[PDB]
Structures are given as structure tokens and as C-alpha cells.
Amino acid sequence: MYIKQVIIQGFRSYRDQTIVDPFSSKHNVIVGRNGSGKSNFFYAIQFVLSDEFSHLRPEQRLALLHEGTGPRVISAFVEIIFDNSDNRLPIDKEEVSLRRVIGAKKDQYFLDKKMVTKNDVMNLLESAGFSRSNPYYIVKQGKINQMATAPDSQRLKLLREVAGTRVYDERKEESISLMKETEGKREKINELLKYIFSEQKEKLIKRQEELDRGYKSIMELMNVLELRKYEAIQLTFKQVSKNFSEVFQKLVPGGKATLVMKFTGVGIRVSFTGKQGEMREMQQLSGGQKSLVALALIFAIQKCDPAPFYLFDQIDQALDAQHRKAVSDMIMELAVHAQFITTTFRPELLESADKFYGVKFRNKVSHIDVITAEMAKDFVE
Amino acid sequence: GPLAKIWLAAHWDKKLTKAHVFECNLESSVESIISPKVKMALRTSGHLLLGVVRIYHRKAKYLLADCNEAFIKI
Numbered sequence: 462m463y464i465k466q467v468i469i470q471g472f473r474s475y476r477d478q479t480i481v482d483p484f485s486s487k488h489n490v491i492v493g494r495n496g497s498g499k500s501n502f503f504y505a506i507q508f509v510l511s512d513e514f515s516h517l518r519p520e521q522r523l524a525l526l527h528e529g530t531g532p533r534v535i536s537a538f539v540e541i542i543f544d545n546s547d548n549r550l551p552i553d554k555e556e557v558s559l560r561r562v563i564g565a566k567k568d569q570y571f572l573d574k575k576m577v578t579k580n581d582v583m584n585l586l587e588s589a590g591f592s593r594s595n596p597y598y599i600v601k602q603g604k605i606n607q608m609a610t611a612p613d614s615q616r617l618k619l620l621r622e623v624a625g626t627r628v629y630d631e632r633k634e635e636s637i638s639l640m641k642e643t644e645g646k647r648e649k650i651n652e653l654l655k656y657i658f659s660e661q662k663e664k665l666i667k668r669q670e671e672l673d674r675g676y677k678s679i680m681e682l683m684n685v686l687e688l689r690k691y692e693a694i695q696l697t698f699k700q701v702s703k704n705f706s707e708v709f710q711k712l713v714p715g716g717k718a719t720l721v722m723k724f725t726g727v728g729i730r731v732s733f734t735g736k737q738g739e740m741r742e743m744q745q746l747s748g749g750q751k752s753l754v755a756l757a758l759i760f761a762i763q764k765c766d767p768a769p770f771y772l773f774d775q776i777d778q779a780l781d782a783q784h785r786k787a788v789s790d791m792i793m794e795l796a797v798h799a800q801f802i803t804t805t806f807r808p809e810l811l812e813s814a815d816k817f818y819g820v821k822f823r824n825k826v827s828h829i830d831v832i833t834a835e836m837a838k839d840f841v842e
Numbered sequence: 843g844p845l846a847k848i849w850l851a852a853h854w855d856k857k858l859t860k861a862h863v864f865e866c867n868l869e870s871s872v873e874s875i876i877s878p879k880v881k882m883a884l885r886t887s888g889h890l891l892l893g894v895v896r897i898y899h900r901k902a903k904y905l906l907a908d909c910n911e912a913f914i915k916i
């Protein structure tokens with residue numbers, strides 16, 4: 462599962478139908494001036510996929526609608542065509558089309574040209590391992606430097622959500638209520654068994670016997686899950702920590718970084734100079750250093766709950782050439798197991814990229830076109 | 843594997859017919875969630891739990907049908 466193609470119309474600066482040439486399954490990079498349409502493209506994808514855009518009041522819908530001089534637009538849609546070669550999407554098609562259509566009085570999803578609720582859509586996406594939980598499939602510069610400057614309290618909240626305790630509790634409450642719904646049906650088959658063609662009795666009583674052993678296994682399962690729910694936060698901490706230290710050491714060769722608990726919050730201690738007990742707290746790092754470390758932590762968390770594709774909107778803005786090359790080298794490594802769509806103003810990520818796209822704002826609308834490695838590099842310098 | 847069918851019953855119970863509901867052994871399904879394989883985060887475990895209870899629920903309802911039609915035939 463990856464993004465094979467995107468179609469946009471009437472959506473912010475993409476006023477006119479915009480059919481983006483099919484993406485590489487590896488690393489796509491997008492370049493263009495301030496104001497050209499890059500974040501608008503990423504917002505178009507988030508409009509379809511992100512849980513936070515799933516509900517919009519009229520005031521937010523019309524901000525999505527293109528506005529400008531000339532032809533006035535009244536409706537917008539984004540369509541994503543997913544390649545489904547790995548069969549992660551529970552639909553027997555090589556290509557799966559998901560479209561959201563927005564107007565002032567309309568808001569509808571179409572799965573393979575047929576209407577589906579918002580609940581269908583988020584269930585479909587979780588089926589394929591793309592959660593409404595882990596919201597790190599898409600990263601923005603504003604997300605990075607917001608994480609750069611966040612307190613220890615924020616990082617513990619972050620850790621709780623990647624642990625998954627909240628959704629586990631919702632699934633359990635859902636499960637239990639559905640359990641109660643079967644206990645009433647199980648009563649109207651066990652009490653209903655009084656009456657009992659002699660073989661079908663034994664074959665049905667076999668199946669009653671099966672529901673009785675499964676009830677017991679379900680009760681056992683609920684015990685082991687309830688006991689590990691209280692180990693989750695500490696276990697994910699342990700896991701993200703190890704990931705975080707390995708990621709930072711790949712980014713900063715001789716460096717060292719760890720997470721520390723306190724439970725009140727999650728702190729970071731880091732040494733760029735080389736494990737020499739030069740462990741600085743996060744808040745005393747430099748601006749660029751905080752942003753690299755924020756990125757390493759994101760990479761560590763993505764590793765705890767991986768996604769089939771990643772959207773990165775300007776992640777190397779605060780980074781110097783050395784650290785940009787390190788981010789690029791990492792991206793090239795990750796891009797063999799997951800799709801990447803990124804935007805940058807510097808050449809280092811270009812070396813890491815299999816396909817290049819240029820974004821231009823012309824004649825009141827954004828345009829996105831396939832370009833060559835040379836043109837991307839030429840634009841960037 | 844069987845965890846995959848459980849995963850499908852959690853999120854996309856549509857593409858799941860009687861044949862999976864009858865073939866499925868809850869006791870072993872549950873056992874593969876409790877015991878190793880690739881260890882799961884709490885979030886996935888919660889989905890698989892709902893899938894197991896989903897199939898348990900279907901198995902119970904299907905038995906309800908084959909009963910309310912064999913007690914109306916004998």
C-alpha cells in the first residue's frame with residue numbers, strides 16, 4: 462500500500478483539476494518557491510486521510526475551497542489512488558480509489574466510486590495498518606520545532622498515545638458490550654436447547670460446547686491484556702528509548718542520546734560531542750540541535766508503529782549541511798521499505814530521491830509537474 | 843495466518859463470511875494473541891480482542907439461527 466496517484470480539484474490553490482503523475486513507491490521530492498502549492502498538496506492528502514480533518518464546520522470547509530479572482534468554485538474534491546499490490550487494503554483490486562468531496566452543504570467520501578461513511582473510511586485505513594492513532598505519517602516543520610521546544614510533560618503525553626492505552630480501553634469497552642450481547646443470545650440457545658435429526662442435536666451441542674470453551678479463552682485473553690495495559694507505558698518507553706538512541710547515533714556518528722522518565726514527563730539528554738558525559742538537557746541544545754533531536758525522536762516513534770508512506774513538509778529547515786546529509790542518508794535507508802513524499806529547499810535530500818516534482822504558481826493556480834534530477838538541483842541552488 | 847482473519851473481523855467485518863466464522867478456532871486464535879509470535883503493542887492487541895469477540899459473536903448468532911430453524915422443524 463502506497464500512494465500511486467492524487468487528483469485535486471477546487472482545493473485551495475489547486476483550483477483546476479490536477480492529476481499528479483504517478484508517484485514512485487520510494488522517495489518523491491517536491492520543490493518550488495514560497496507560495497507555490499507544496500503544503501496545499503500535503504493538506505489535500507491530509508483532508509482525505511487525517512482524523513483531524515474528518516470533521517469540519519462550515520467555517521473550515523470554505524477555507525479549503527479555492528478563493529480568488531476569476532471562476533468561483535463551489536465544490537472541491539481530492540482523490541487518492543492507492544496501489545494495493547501488498548493486498549493490505551481489504552479490497553480485491555490492484556488499485557483502490559478514495560475520494561472526499563466537499564461543499565458548503567456537502568461532505569462525502571466515495572470508496573471506489575461508491576458512497577461510504579466516515580466510519581467505513583477510518584476502519585478501512587486501520588485494516589491496512591494505517592492508524593487514526595499514530596499521527597506521524599505526516600510531519601511538518603511546525604511539528605518539528607513545536608516538538609523541539611516542548612516541555613517534558615508534552616513528551617509523556619506523546620508516549621501515552623503511542624503506547625495505545627486509550628484505544629485499548631475503547632476496544633475493551635466495545636468488546637465487553639458485545640460480550641453481553643452474546644450472553645443473551647447464548648441464553649436463548651442453551652435454554653432453547655430443551656426441545657432437542659438426532660445427529661444435528663449432537664452437532665449443535667458440539668457448537669454450544671465450542672462457544673463455552675471460547676468464552677473461557679476470551680476471559681483468559683482479557684486478563685493477559687489487562688495486565689499488560691499497565692506494562693504498556695513502561696514497555697513503549699523502553700522501546701522508543703532504544704530506537705531513539707540508535708537513530709541519533711546514526712544521525713550524529715559519535716553522539717549519544719537517551720530519554721529519561723520522571724510519572725511526570727519524559728526528558729531528553731543528548732551529547733553531540735561524543736558520549737563524553739556531555740549530556741545536555743534538550744532545552745539547552747542549540748536551535749538546529751533541538752530540531753535534529755526532535756526529528757530523531759519522530760523517526761524512533763515511526764519505528765514503533767510503522768506506516769506504508771510518509772509525508773514530510775520541510776523537515777531540514779533549521780539544519781546545517783552536515784545534519785541535512787545525515788537526514789538524507791537516513792531517508793534513503795527508510796525509503797526501501799516505505800514510500801516518502803518530501804519538500805526541501807536544499808540539495809541534500811535530492812541525492813536521496815527517485816522521482817522529482819516541481820510546483821509552480823501561475824495564472825492564479827498551482828501546477829505540479831514531473832521534473833528531472835538536474836532541474837530540481839538547479840532550482841535548489 | 844489466523845491473526846489476519848482476526849484483524850479483518852476487528853476493522854472490516856464485511857469481507858468475512860460464515861466459512862471463516864465456522865472454520866475459526868477461538869481457543870487457538872486467543873492462544874496466538876496471548877503467546878509470542880511477533881510481540882504486539884497494546885493497541886493491536888485491543889483490535890485483535892475485538893476481532894475475537896466479533897467472531898465469537900457471529901458464531902453465537904449463527905448457532906442461534908440453526909437452532910431457531912431446527913426447533914421449528916422438529
Ligand SMILES: Nc1ncnc2c1ncn2[C@@H]1O[C@H](COP(=O)(O)OP(=O)(O)OP(O)(O)=S)[C@@H](O)[C@H]1O
Pocket residue numbers: 472473474493494495496497498499500501502523524525526527528529820
Ligand atoms: N483557499 C485558498 N484559495 C486560494 N489560494 C489559497 C487558498 N489557501 C491558500 N492559498 C494560497 O496558495 C498558495 C500556496 O500555498 P502553500 O501550498 O501553503 O505554499 P508553499 O509551497 O507551501 O510555500 P512555503 O510554505 O512558503 S515554502 C499561497 O499563496 C496561499 O495564500
Ligand SMILES: [Mg+2]
Pocket residue numbers: 499500774
Ligand atoms: Mg508550506
